[PDB]
Amino acid sequence: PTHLSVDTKFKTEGLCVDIPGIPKDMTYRRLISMMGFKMNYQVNGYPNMFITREEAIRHVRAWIGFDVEGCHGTNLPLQLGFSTGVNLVAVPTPLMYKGLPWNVVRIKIVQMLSDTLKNLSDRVVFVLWAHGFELTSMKYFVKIGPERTCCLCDRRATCFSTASDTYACWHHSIGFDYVYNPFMIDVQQWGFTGNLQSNHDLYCQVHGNAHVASCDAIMTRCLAVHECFVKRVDWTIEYPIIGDELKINAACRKVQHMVVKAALLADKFPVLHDIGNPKAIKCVPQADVEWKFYDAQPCSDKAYKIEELFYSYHSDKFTDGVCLFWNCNVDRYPANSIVCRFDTRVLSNLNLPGCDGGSLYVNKHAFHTPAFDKSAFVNLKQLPFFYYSDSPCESHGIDYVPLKSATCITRCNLGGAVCRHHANEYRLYLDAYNMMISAGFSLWVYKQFDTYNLWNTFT
Numbered sequence: 333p334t335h336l337s338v339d340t341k342f343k344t345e346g347l348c349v350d351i352p353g354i355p356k357d358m359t360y361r362r363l364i365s366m367m368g369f370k371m372n373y374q375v376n377g378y379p380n381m382f383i384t385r386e387e388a389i390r391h392v393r394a395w396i397g398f399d400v401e402g403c404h405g406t407n408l409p410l411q412l413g414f415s416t417g418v419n420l421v422a423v424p425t426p427l428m429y430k431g432l433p434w435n436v437v438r439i440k441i442v443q444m445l446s447d448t449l450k451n452l453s454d455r456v457v458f459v460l461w462a463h464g465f466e467l468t469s470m471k472y473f474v475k476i477g478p479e480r481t482c483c484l485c486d487r488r489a490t491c492f493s494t495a496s497d498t499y500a501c502w503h504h505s506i507g508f509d510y511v512y513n514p515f516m517i518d519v520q521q522w523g524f525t526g527n528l529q530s531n532h533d534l535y536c537q538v539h540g541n542a543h544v545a546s547c548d549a550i551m552t553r554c555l556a557v558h559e560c561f562v563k564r565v566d567w568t569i570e571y572p573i574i575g576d577e578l579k580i581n582a583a584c585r586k587v588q589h590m591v592v593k594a595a596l597l598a599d600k601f602p603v604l605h606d607i608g609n610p611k612a613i614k615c616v617p618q619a620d621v622e623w624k625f626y627d628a629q630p631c632s633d634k635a636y637k638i639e640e641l642f643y644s645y646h647s648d649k650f651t652d653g654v655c656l657f658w659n660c661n662v663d664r665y666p667a668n669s670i671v672c673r674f675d676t677r678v679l680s681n682l683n684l685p686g687c688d689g690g691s692l693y694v695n696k697h698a699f700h701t702p703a704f705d706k707s708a709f710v711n712l713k714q715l716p717f718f719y720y721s722d723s724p725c726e727s728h729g730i731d732y733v734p735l736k737s738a739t740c741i742t743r744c745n746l747g748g749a750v751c752r753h754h755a756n757e758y759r760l761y762l763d764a765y766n767m768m769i770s771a772g773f774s775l776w777v778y779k780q781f782d783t784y785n786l787w788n789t790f791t
């Protein structure tokens with residue numbers, strides 16, 4: 333069972349206010365036909381417009397909440413709302429656009445989806461809380477058929493143009509008017525009691541109902557994200573490379589080793605309490621310190637309470653030595669800590685909007701992260717950039733401009749002049765550090781941390 337069978341039953345109860353008299357007995361096969369689409373017994377890669385929850389989770393980067401609200405259905409104008417925040421008004425003659433005929437509305441839809449998704453996914457998945465009008469309005473902007481490739485490249489086709497009779501992906505669809513072979517999923521098929529707002533508001537106070545189609549579109553995708561990534565966590569699902577994933581992950585490992593190695597050298601803690609990933613390895617394997625591990629999986633709902641991670645009866649005394657929370661999201665870090673905390677507000681192709689202020693960070697695996705909270709860091713300070721190295725000054729083996737920097741903590745800089753080797757390594761480390769900060773990661777440290785204490789490791 334790779335795809336959702338068209339002969340699967342579709343509960344039509346959510347649809348009978350917009351569509352009175354709808355048959356209770358309904359399949360996807362009959363529903364698609366009623367939506368004005370003909371699938372012609374086609375075995376060409378598009379078995380069903382609707383997909384399973386599992387296929388939706390694999391394609392989370394494609395999710396776009398979609399809601400249609402009748403302003404007045406043949407004679408009435410429709411308000412089309414998308415989880416991008418956009419509201420279009422289609423006439424059959426927070427961004428609010430005035431009423432316009434479908435032929436121009438469909439051009440705006442292709443532009444919006446292509447700009448939102450070209451750097452995220454090879455498709456669109458319309459996330460619905462279906463009541464009727466969203467499904468009946470799809471014939472006005474969607475064309476279906478066999479799976480196709482782009483006219484300008486090797487990617488799959490997501491748009492079609494009636495002006496040129498051609499197909500295009502999200503990158504080459506300027507001037508295209510039809511969404512081609514989109515996917516969709518109705519959240520209302522998952523067995524919920526009550527309406528959209530009552531189920532959304534049980535888990536999220538960040539999205540409100542300003543009573544427009546885009547507000548519902550946002551709540552719909554938010555509730556779908558809560559169900560599939562907050563209260564259900566699957567870290568087995570792999571996701572494609574769409575940006576700087578490999579460099580960001582490599583930078584993270586270099587910054588962790590650098591920052592922990594320097595903290596151990598500058599303050600000589602007898603013990604390190606490593607709280608986080610149960611699969612973690614010693615990031616500074618040559619350090620003299622007693623390394624003690626504590627398992628805690630990445631929290632996807634609310635941040636861990638420090639009182640529950642530490643208390644209720646390990647050295648038992650976490651106040652001895654230093655605590656390392658590398659992506660272990662707690663409500664208030666202890667004063668003796670080294671912390672790496674993902675900033676959920678960061679704008680990037682890897683970070684998708686999430687539930688209750690949190691975000692869905694997708695890098696190889698999907699990780700819903702609780703909202704960034706500045707108050708979690710009151711006992712700590714921001715960790716300044718610095719590069720430390722006790723490696724011998726020796727070139728071995730990229731042209732050179734002399735490096736002058738107060739943050740290159742090396743024997744050569746102490747002795748007056750930075751050597752070529754440490755200058756190349758400094759600039760490579762600064763690049764890795766900047767990559768990690770820009771990816772949304774933030775670094776925090778105990779208030780006594782001072783890089784001045786690293787110069788005396790050169791005696």
Ligand SMILES: O=C(CN1CCCC1)Nc1ccc(F)cc1
Binds near residue numbers: 354363364366
């Ligand atoms: O079933 C009907 C027609 N209704 C019920 C009987 C007479 C009026 N339409 C329809 C159903 C689902 C859908 F997605 C689009 C259209």
Ligand SMILES: [Zn+2]
Binds near residue numbers: 485500
């Ligand atoms: Zn293309």
Ligand SMILES: [Zn+2]
Binds near residue numbers: 532536550551686
């Ligand atoms: Zn929400």
Ligand SMILES: [Zn+2]
Binds near residue numbers: 744750
């Ligand atoms: Zn040097």
